[PDB]
Amino acid sequence: MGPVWRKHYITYRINNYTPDMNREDVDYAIRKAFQVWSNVTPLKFSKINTGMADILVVFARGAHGDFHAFDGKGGILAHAFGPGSGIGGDAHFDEDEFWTTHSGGTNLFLTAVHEIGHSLGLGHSSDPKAVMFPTYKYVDINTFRLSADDIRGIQSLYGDPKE
Numbered sequence: 001m002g003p004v005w006r007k008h009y010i011t012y013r014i015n016n017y018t019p020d021m022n023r024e025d026v027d028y029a030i031r032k033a034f035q036v037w038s039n040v041t042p043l044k045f046s047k048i049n050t051g052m053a054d055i056l057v058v059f060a061r062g063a064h065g066d067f068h069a070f071d072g073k074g075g076i077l078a079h080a081f082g083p084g085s086g087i088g089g090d091a092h093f094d095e096d097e098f099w100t101t102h103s104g105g106t107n108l109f110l111t112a113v114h115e116i117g118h119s120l121g122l123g124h125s126s127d128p129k130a131v132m133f134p135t136y137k138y139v140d141i142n143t144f145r146l147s148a149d150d151i152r153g154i155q156s157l158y159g160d161p162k163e
């Protein structure tokens with residue numbers, strides 16, 4: 001067993017915004033990524049604009065103060081921290097990538113789903129169909145669906161949705 005969030009209502013805050021997409025699209029990509037996970041668990045996610053959030057969403061480049069500097073465009077696209085104190089739960093997105101609403105460059109939505117996965121306590125999957133698979137690969141975002149391995153992994157930590 002690993003650490004998990006100990007409450008079902010979780011807040012998130014977007015600390016800053018990439019200039020690559022407007023505010024609405026960043027908000028939307030992120031909201032929809034949390035929704036992928038709340039659809040298969042009892043978890044509820046909500047965006048806040050002031051105060052300390054459970055999960056902080058940050059865009060940053062190179063060294064940004066957590067001992068895991070980013071590596072410019074390509075390579076690692078983002079990273080996140082599992083349920084914990086302090087930094088616990090935050091999701092950082094390498095601002096040197098080029099973030100897009102679709103397949104223009106690095107899809108923000110798919111990346112967010114992957115990273116939120118980590119923020120929720122999940123690790124990597126060896127299943128090539130899983131969102132938690134270690135390698136980014138674009139998939140039509142209107143067709144996107146968690147894999148069975150993803151769902152079994154997240155339900156093992158939080159259970160399924162209630163009646």
Ligand SMILES: O=C(O)C[C@@H](O)CCc1ccc(-c2ccccc2)cc1
Pocket residue numbers: 075076077078079080110111114115118129130131132133134135136137138139
């Ligand atoms: O491993 C990490 O958390 C650091 C990041 O560099 C990894 C980014 C990433 C982003 C999307 C995916 C993915 C995207 C679509 C479908 C399945 C997986 C996989 C991986």
Ligand SMILES: [Ca+2]
Pocket residue numbers: 070071072073074075076077078094096097
């Ligand atoms: Ca990078």
Ligand SMILES: [Zn+2]
Pocket residue numbers: 064066068079092
């Ligand atoms: Zn970081």
Ligand SMILES: [Zn+2]
Pocket residue numbers: 114118124132134
């Ligand atoms: Zn990962």
